[PDB]
Motif scaffolding. Sequence first.
Motif, PDB file in Angstrom:
ATOM      1  N   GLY A   1      39.077  24.172  39.109  1.00 23.17           N
ATOM      2  CA  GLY A   1      38.719  25.517  39.516  1.00 23.17           C
ATOM      3  C   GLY A   1      39.855  26.513  39.390  1.00 23.17           C
ATOM      4  N   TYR A   2      40.896  26.133  38.654  1.00 23.37           N
ATOM      5  CA  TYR A   2      42.083  26.962  38.494  1.00 23.37           C
ATOM      6  C   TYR A   2      42.113  27.729  37.180  1.00 23.37           C
ATOM      7  CZ  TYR A   2      43.325  23.355  41.879  1.00 23.37           C
ATOM      8  OH  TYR A   2      43.321  22.470  42.928  1.00 23.37           O
ATOM      9  N   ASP A   3      41.022  27.737  36.424  1.00 19.57           N
ATOM     10  CA  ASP A   3      41.007  28.327  35.094  1.00 19.57           C
ATOM     11  C   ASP A   3      40.423  29.732  35.057  1.00 19.57           C
ATOM     12  OD1 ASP A   3      41.427  25.497  34.729  1.00 19.57           O
ATOM     13  OD2 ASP A   3      39.252  25.311  34.546  1.00 19.57           O
ATOM     14  N   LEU A   4      40.101  30.322  36.203  1.00 24.13           N
ATOM     15  CA  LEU A   4      39.245  31.499  36.233  1.00 24.13           C
ATOM     16  C   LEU A   4      39.952  32.776  36.654  1.00 24.13           C
ATOM     17  CD1 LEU A   4      36.562  29.494  38.114  1.00 24.13           C
ATOM     18  CD2 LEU A   4      36.449  30.057  35.690  1.00 24.13           C
TER      19      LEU A   4
ATOM     20  N   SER B   1      45.588  34.851  39.235  1.00 28.41           N
ATOM     21  CA  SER B   1      46.216  34.889  40.545  1.00 28.41           C
ATOM     22  C   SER B   1      46.270  33.494  41.145  1.00 28.41           C
ATOM     23  CB  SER B   1      45.468  35.838  41.475  1.00 28.41           C
ATOM     24  OG  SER B   1      45.668  37.181  41.096  1.00 28.41           O
ATOM     25  N   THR B   2      46.082  32.481  40.309  1.00 29.96           N
ATOM     26  CA  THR B   2      46.005  31.098  40.760  1.00 29.96           C
ATOM     27  C   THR B   2      46.954  30.265  39.913  1.00 29.96           C
ATOM     28  OG1 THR B   2      43.674  31.512  41.236  1.00 29.96           O
ATOM     29  CG2 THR B   2      44.432  29.246  41.369  1.00 29.96           C
ATOM     30  N   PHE B   3      48.021  29.769  40.525  1.00 29.91           N
ATOM     31  CA  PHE B   3      48.835  28.744  39.903  1.00 29.91           C
ATOM     32  C   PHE B   3      48.068  27.433  39.877  1.00 29.91           C
ATOM     33  CE2 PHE B   3      52.483  31.507  40.937  1.00 29.91           C
ATOM     34  CZ  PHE B   3      53.130  31.458  39.734  1.00 29.91           C
ATOM     35  N   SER B   4      48.191  26.721  38.779  1.00 32.44           N
ATOM     36  CA  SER B   4      47.728  25.348  38.692  1.00 32.44           C
ATOM     37  C   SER B   4      48.587  24.478  39.593  1.00 32.44           C
ATOM     38  CB  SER B   4      47.789  24.889  37.237  1.00 32.44           C
ATOM     39  OG  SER B   4      47.532  23.507  37.087  1.00 32.44           O
TER      40      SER B   4
ATOM     41  N   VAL C   1      49.504  29.150  34.316  1.00 34.24           N
ATOM     42  CA  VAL C   1      48.495  30.205  34.382  1.00 34.24           C
ATOM     43  C   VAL C   1      47.609  30.068  33.147  1.00 34.24           C
ATOM     44  CG1 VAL C   1      48.051  32.615  34.843  1.00 34.24           C
ATOM     45  CG2 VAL C   1      50.204  31.613  35.531  1.00 34.24           C
TER      46      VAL C   1
ATOM     47  N   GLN D   1      44.822  31.405  32.342  1.00 30.89           N
ATOM     48  CA  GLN D   1      44.233  32.602  31.755  1.00 30.89           C
ATOM     49  C   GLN D   1      45.132  33.175  30.669  1.00 30.89           C
ATOM     50  OE1 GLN D   1      41.062  34.476  32.265  1.00 30.89           O
ATOM     51  NE2 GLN D   1      40.732  32.300  32.659  1.00 30.89           N
TER      52      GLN D   1
ATOM     53  N   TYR E   1      45.003  30.923  27.645  1.00 33.98           N
ATOM     54  CA  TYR E   1      43.807  31.125  26.827  1.00 33.98           C
ATOM     55  C   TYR E   1      43.862  32.419  26.021  1.00 33.98           C
ATOM     56  CZ  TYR E   1      41.749  27.530  29.865  1.00 33.98           C
ATOM     57  OH  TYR E   1      41.488  26.370  30.552  1.00 33.98           O
TER      58      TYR E   1
ATOM     59  N   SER F   1      43.620  39.657  39.998  1.00 33.01           N
ATOM     60  CA  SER F   1      42.273  39.168  39.737  1.00 33.01           C
ATOM     61  C   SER F   1      41.332  40.260  39.251  1.00 33.01           C
ATOM     62  CB  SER F   1      41.695  38.518  40.996  1.00 33.01           C
ATOM     63  OG  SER F   1      41.533  39.470  42.033  1.00 33.01           O
TER      64      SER F   1
ATOM     65  N   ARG G   1      42.403  41.316  33.323  1.00 38.27           N
ATOM     66  CA  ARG G   1      42.670  40.162  32.482  1.00 38.27           C
ATOM     67  C   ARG G   1      43.790  40.495  31.510  1.00 38.27           C
ATOM     68  NH1 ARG G   1      41.326  41.279  27.435  1.00 38.27           N
ATOM     69  NH2 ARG G   1      39.424  42.463  26.975  1.00 38.27           N
TER      70      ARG G   1
ATOM     71  N   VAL H   1      37.030  36.832  32.028  1.00 38.17           N
ATOM     72  CA  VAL H   1      37.332  35.410  32.035  1.00 38.17           C
ATOM     73  C   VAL H   1      37.327  34.910  30.599  1.00 38.17           C
ATOM     74  CG1 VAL H   1      36.554  33.131  32.726  1.00 38.17           C
ATOM     75  CG2 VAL H   1      36.491  34.981  34.348  1.00 38.17           C
TER      76      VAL H   1
ATOM     77  N   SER I   1      37.487  31.809  27.879  1.00 41.41           N
ATOM     78  CA  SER I   1      37.085  30.418  27.768  1.00 41.41           C
ATOM     79  C   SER I   1      38.248  29.591  27.258  1.00 41.41           C
ATOM     80  CB  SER I   1      35.880  30.309  26.841  1.00 41.41           C
ATOM     81  OG  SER I   1      35.932  31.295  25.827  1.00 41.41           O
TER      82      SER I   1
ATOM     83  N   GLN J   1      37.506  45.134  30.110  1.00 39.31           N
ATOM     84  CA  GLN J   1      38.709  44.530  30.654  1.00 39.31           C
ATOM     85  C   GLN J   1      38.750  44.444  32.176  1.00 39.31           C
ATOM     86  OE1 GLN J   1      42.136  46.266  28.823  1.00 39.31           O
ATOM     87  NE2 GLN J   1      43.406  44.448  29.124  1.00 39.31           N
TER      88      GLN J   1
ATOM     89  N   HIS K   1      43.638  27.710  46.290  1.00 40.04           N
ATOM     90  CA  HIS K   1      43.353  28.820  45.399  1.00 40.04           C
ATOM     91  C   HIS K   1      43.902  30.152  45.874  1.00 40.04           C
ATOM     92  CE1 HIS K   1      40.392  25.833  44.063  1.00 40.04           C
ATOM     93  NE2 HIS K   1      40.391  26.476  42.911  1.00 40.04           N
TER      94      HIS K   1
ATOM     95  N   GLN L   1      49.613  27.302  47.740  1.00 38.39           N
ATOM     96  CA  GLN L   1      49.769  28.223  46.622  1.00 38.39           C
ATOM     97  C   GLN L   1      51.186  28.756  46.485  1.00 38.39           C
ATOM     98  OE1 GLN L   1      47.209  28.216  44.771  1.00 38.39           O
ATOM     99  NE2 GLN L   1      47.626  29.808  43.278  1.00 38.39           N
TER     100      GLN L   1
ATOM    101  N   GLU M   1      45.189  39.118  46.852  1.00 40.16           N
ATOM    102  CA  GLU M   1      44.731  39.613  45.559  1.00 40.16           C
ATOM    103  C   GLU M   1      45.740  39.403  44.436  1.00 40.16           C
ATOM    104  OE1 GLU M   1      46.142  43.133  45.634  1.00 40.16           O
ATOM    105  OE2 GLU M   1      46.541  43.102  47.793  1.00 40.16           O
TER     106      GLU M   1
ATOM    107  N   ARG N   1      49.566  37.226  43.073  1.00 34.85           N
ATOM    108  CA  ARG N   1      50.213  35.928  43.107  1.00 34.85           C
ATOM    109  C   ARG N   1      51.715  36.093  43.284  1.00 34.85           C
ATOM    110  NH1 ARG N   1      53.092  35.226  38.653  1.00 34.85           N
ATOM    111  NH2 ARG N   1      52.448  36.147  36.667  1.00 34.85           N
TER     112      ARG N   1
END
Lengths: 232, 239, 247, 229, 233, 234, 240, 204
Positions: free
Chosen positions: B1-4, B7-10, B15, B17, B20, B121, B124, F9, F11, F118, G10, G22, G128, G130
Amino acid sequence: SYDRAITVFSPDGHLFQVEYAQEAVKKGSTAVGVRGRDIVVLGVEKKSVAKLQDERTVRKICALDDNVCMAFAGLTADARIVINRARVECQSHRLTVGDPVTVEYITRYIASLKQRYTQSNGRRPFGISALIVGFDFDGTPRLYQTDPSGTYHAWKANAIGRGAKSVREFLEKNYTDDAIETDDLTIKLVIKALLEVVQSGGKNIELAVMRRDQPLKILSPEEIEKYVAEIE
Amino acid sequence: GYDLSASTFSPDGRVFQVEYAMKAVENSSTAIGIRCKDGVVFGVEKLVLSKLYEEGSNKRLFNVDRHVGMAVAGLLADARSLADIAREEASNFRSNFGYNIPLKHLADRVAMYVHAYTLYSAVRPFGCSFMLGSYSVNDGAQLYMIDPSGVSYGYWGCAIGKARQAAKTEIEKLQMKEMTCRDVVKEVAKIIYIVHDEVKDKAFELELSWVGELTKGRHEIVPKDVREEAEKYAKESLK
Amino acid sequence: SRRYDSRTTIFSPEGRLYQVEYAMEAIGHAGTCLGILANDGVLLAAERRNIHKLLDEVFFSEKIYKLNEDMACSVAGITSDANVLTNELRLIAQRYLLQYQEPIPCEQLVTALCDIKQAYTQFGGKRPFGVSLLYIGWDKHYGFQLYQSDPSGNYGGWKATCIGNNSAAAVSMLKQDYKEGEMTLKSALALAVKVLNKTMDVSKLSAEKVEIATLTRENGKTVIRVLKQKEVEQLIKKHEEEEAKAE
Amino acid sequence: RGYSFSLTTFSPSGKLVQIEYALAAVAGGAPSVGIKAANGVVLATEKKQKSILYDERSVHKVEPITKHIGLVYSGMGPDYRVLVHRARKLAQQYYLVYQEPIPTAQLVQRVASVMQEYTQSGGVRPFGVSLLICGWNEGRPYLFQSDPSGAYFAWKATAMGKNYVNGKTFLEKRYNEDLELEDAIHTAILTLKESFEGQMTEDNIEVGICNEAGFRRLTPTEVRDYLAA
Amino acid sequence: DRGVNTFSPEGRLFQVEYAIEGHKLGSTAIGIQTSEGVCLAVEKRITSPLMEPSSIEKIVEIDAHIGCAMSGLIADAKTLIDKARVETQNHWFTYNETMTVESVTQAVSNLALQFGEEDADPGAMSRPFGVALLFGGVDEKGPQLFHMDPSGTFVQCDARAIGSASEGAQSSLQEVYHKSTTLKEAIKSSLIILKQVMEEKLNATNIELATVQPGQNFHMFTKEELEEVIKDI
Amino acid sequence: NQYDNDVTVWSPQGRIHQIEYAMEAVKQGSATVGLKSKTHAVLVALKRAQSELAAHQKKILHVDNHIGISIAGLTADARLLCNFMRQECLDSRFVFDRPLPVSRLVSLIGSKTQIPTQRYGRRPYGVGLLIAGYDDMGPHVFQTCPSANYFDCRAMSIGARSQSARTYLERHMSEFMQCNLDELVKHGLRALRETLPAEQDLTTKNVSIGIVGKDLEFTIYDDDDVSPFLDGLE
Amino acid sequence: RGSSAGFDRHITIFSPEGRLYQVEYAFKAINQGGLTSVAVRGKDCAVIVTQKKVPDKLLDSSTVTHLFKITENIGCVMTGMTADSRSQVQRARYEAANWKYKYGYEIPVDMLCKRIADISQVYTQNAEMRPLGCCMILIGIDEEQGPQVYKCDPAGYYCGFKATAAGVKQTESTSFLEKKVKKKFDWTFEQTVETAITCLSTVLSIDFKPSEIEVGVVTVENPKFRILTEAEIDAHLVAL
Amino acid sequence: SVMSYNGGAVMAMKGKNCVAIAADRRFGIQAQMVTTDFQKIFPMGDRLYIGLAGLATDVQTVAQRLKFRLNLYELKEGRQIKPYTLMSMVANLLYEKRFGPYYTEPVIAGLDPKTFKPFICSLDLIGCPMVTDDFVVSGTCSEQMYGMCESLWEPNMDPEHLFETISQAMLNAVDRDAVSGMGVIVHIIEKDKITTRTLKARMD
């Protein structure tokens, strides 16, 4: 600022938030109102009085103006907000146009508010249903009814809350231009229409009458008590 | 659930995102750049998908200022957004201080702008990388390269695109420190024609640009006679 | 973002409000508080929840909070929210006095607070306050009064109520010992002591597990006075004596 | 631009588990101790550095707020710093309006109000720290404690951090109401000594006092003499 | 799960696709355009004999030459009706002339799709509307009849039917209609189809009917004339 | 199955499924065709058969004296874009007292279309366009996409089943330059006839025709004004 | 060990243990670059050394620097994510200029460190954004104390040191420096460059050439922050 | 002038463990009297009064805002305010409107709540506090009561002699002012008593 869509469409075109608000308003205490020749009357049921309250503070029948009054079912905390906004609107109309409101004017205002809370961001819908009665300058009594969705109609007589499913069938069959001739005839009509849903027996009811004079008069417990004996 | 979200470190401190948005570039057609004594030379293999388009559509070489070029790779809409930002940065600098902006300062400003889109978040990261290049009697030729993450380094020759591996390998055997633009241009044509795949992609277009002392410090596009000759030389060299 | 939202202000498939239903159960486990109305004034009587030896009794009370020259309250639930509510009540009373140059009536105060409690259940995304209140007061129109609010935002006047823990049995026994119109302040104190003595699981009261305030009118002035340990001890002795004598 | 929804909500039993978890965080800090005597208060902490490389002088755990108030903590230091800064600002505003030094109770009330605001706003977590406030005003010493939720108390002798249960279990026995400040320091030190797993030194602990003349933290040269006994 | 703005694997906008399904649960209406005017007609769908029938208004007047008939969420339709009235009055105020049915339909269709839940407006919509409309009127080119959807697509018709029985109502309207009608045969056939498809009995208080023609204003039928027409049929 | 909902997002393959779906929306519409010669540009569209009783649609709109467009996709978004383009041209004529170059117009359109793609809680414009204009440099047949990149082309067709029209176009592009206006328009109507199934031929009310050129403003041709063009298609 | 409940891994909210997972992940992000720094302070000098590993030989290595100048007498070395570190350096420069503008004199090293640390504490609380995945080390001469060496981290903790080491080999590179603060004040004279280079080489086995490190210097004799040349670095390396 | 539009005169004097404050009663407009029972002295505390002079509307407004803030303070803290603290709060209130100020000059007189030590002070329109040890004045006959107090004042006076002196000063001061008079009220704040009196003055 909170900006989220709380009430949105669903497969098969339903609004689940509005349906849930109506499922909530289907749990209040029953209210009944009829439209007389020269009088209008309402009546609310009291689930339990608890032998320790002060009834002066838990009344479900207010007075929005000299000639308009209402009675609700649902959530008291929401009803209070709606009622005070309606009072401020009545005063504004009097100020600007120099004439007391019509019953349909205030019904439209309330329904517009209720609808606006179904399409705005970051709000839930109101959880109440109202019955609005009164007289106008012509001398014609009125009786309306709003919904948590913002739709309103005009009725000869109606009932909201729980048990309305049977109160309506009773009132449909028994309503006729004969039980309408006099006030002490229509009031007994309302009383026996409420009693078969009050399964406690006796009077657990509040009853307010409004005539073209001595507005929003409220029947005393002793006076209401007398009518019950007469019916039997 | 960390791929979206950005603002989320694995659990290992990555990161995905940005990882990708980098693939987005790692499968786009190639563009190269070469620094020289006298100046810089840009070259891009422009792809022609169908006959219907006019030649000149989807240019990848812009003019950020009267002395700065720019070559792009990735999503062309994001690239045009970045080009407007850079034009904005150079014009404000001249209106504040009364002279032309250094390439070192411009790249720093644009990299900060790109990096600001990697933290939240609500947005992108961009999906395009790009190269700059200038020439000034003060500092001579220059060349930079910014990533989707916002890192910017100086180079002697860069190979953003899909055939970066084969492009860089062949450009390192060049001895660019002594050549000149007239002698480099031919080499850019040759290396792009070498790295070009002629199976998957059937037809491709070639456009070049340069900024140096022969153009008096103004970024330009290579004239048509020089280009034709360069293409002929590349073909002869290829066999 | 939508993934992390908890949706505190939505309806349930049966018309319920789950956050309010859960705040009510929070208020369920707090310390017992009880009020009783009489001919010559009202009284509150709470229960002391923090009994540690190493504490300090610097404050004149723990759960009283005089709100005005004529009113006072008591809370059950979360102290942190209680502080916010008490500050708000004081500000409302002073704004009324500034506008009209007269003290505010008790029903108007209770109403203005319950509006704020209700606005936290309809929009904003926040959570609601987990606090229930009791009020006592005196005004020109109706004299001695006693109200009660709840997290949802609806109130009601009473004559002898109770919130907190075991409030169900408290009200059950209150119904059988309260007689309308004939109760004086002393019989009120007796009934309050004798209800608190049972609805608390401990063996017997201690005159420091309790906290008692009254309200009277004397010489055209309202007096709000917290009872003292010796007075409470005397009351407990009196209760001990008569109860023992009967059986 | 920020979240607008709460992150602390009620549970089917009426609990606030985010606040319970901030308390579990506090239960894993370093021990703190406060003891109110007849003419002053005493704060004593365990300032144990990870290795010898760390320069001890640079960071302190016992800080002043005004000329007569000081506090210590247990929990998270980066949060403690925010709280210290806002408390200093609160005291300066009070002095600006009234031209009087703020009392300890008003200080604690305002700080706990801020800590409560961080339990009901949008898109934030609660602080992971509890405080121990000290003060002296109008010829009387005070000692309060503030929780992560926003609830404050008043004590005669308390203990935070790890092994606080045994700390207060031991603290109850010895405590006398006639205790002088100099003989209270021994008990504060001894209480810390019960759970130290090491050897006491003038740089393993911090100590602050507050009496008639104001707040000040003792110097290692004085902690040495006090530790000699 | 999703947001309000979210395409599907066919690019369909789920929320609009649901608001469209919210219309197959309304009471049928019918409009028909002639060379002598337009006529609108809608079923009232009374619930119980205690409800006053003069309190169901589904055919309102936008201006002295335009009328509207709705179906769907009568609570939602009222903001659209109000904004159309206001726009027509603004046009009169500014240009000293009457607006046109095309312009009114176009201006009303521009409110649809104007919804969202982030950076939209101070107070903005949270979902699409759930009402379909039918405009009629006369202007400098003659009688016209338009149709509006929740997606915001407005067309020009000469005989349209909206509601829960339209897939059956149009199957008769396409056979009945011709380019040589008169408003009277139009009215007759519009009544015959209603009677054909309704569940109750078509009498003179559970229907509604209005007409605009080049000579007169917007006029509603009376329980006198309406009864005579029904009896005559 | 968790990357196909939001426009912000990526892929694991570096794609944006939302932008994709917004393109598959544009393929639903009825086909259009544009092309240009030495001095004129031409748009031809196929108005779809909605029902047995309704006037078909409006698929070609004036933008200015020298610019006109033709849409395929969401009509609400299409007219929202048309209003912006009209204001752009009006603003231009107010400040510089001259017309707008079609290239700069398309630049503004692309820069405006890109921003939604975006940010969070927003969606792309679900409409494809086809612009035609005249300027100092001659005609132009730009084309735009829901993903904000645009193209420049001699002749392009967008819509459902436009693959056949595109094949015909390239196969016959060899003579569009020299050809006259009448010849140019017919080349367009044949190409548009290609995409229709077997049971239907062009009539006189399911086609529209726009024309802009050297000495001629942008004009649209009505139901029976297209009669002088369909007389020879045997 | 530490259980989880909800959205713990998360966003920055408390775990059932109060752990803030986190933020434990930005520490792992620190070890992503693959470098290592070492700072040592002496009786009259502070020194920074930094690995300089360029990937291959097409880059203009005159631009690949981890040493930065904040004001005339303050210098810094970053470790972690490059763009993050650039943003942090810009922020520190702005803070240092605003201090002088407001108060009329030059900001101290500990004040600048505390400013950066409370700027990062905010990323640890709101949900919001990181945390930045980078570490920082500062040096400078204080007119009252003398040499100073400070270090921040992504959690907001900003202690002060006698000799630090940050990077991939942090634990053993500090275990080495542990043994040498026993006596002689860790060679408290201008030749602590020897100590820094030796500590960097002992657990890396590179025996660096004259151009695979960067060094920086402040002194009490000349306070400004200087970057030593290749020849100067080579001479020290040659002596080794 | 604006502060001479309704008239008025306030005065405070200090004794040995006692304070005294006095004012006049006339309320009027430019040259015409309306009433003769206007209140200009307000009981801020058990032994803490304040007297206001100047524009009567601003007298009333400032008194009401001050009562607001003092009620809130004594509810939040838990005790009564001190004379020194009250003076600072009033100065802050008046300085908040530095541009567009109230036209009123206050006077404070009280007793220390624990040492029973007197306190007098006056502030200017913008909030400048000056504390004295003999007496303060404010109004339209300031110079007249200056001349009276400088001559008649003595140190360490009893409440009797204090009353005699403040009354004899106010009478002769307002007997020479056109827009002041109609009687004088005197409050005497002792330790355990607060005596009020009304003097007989001239009514012309």
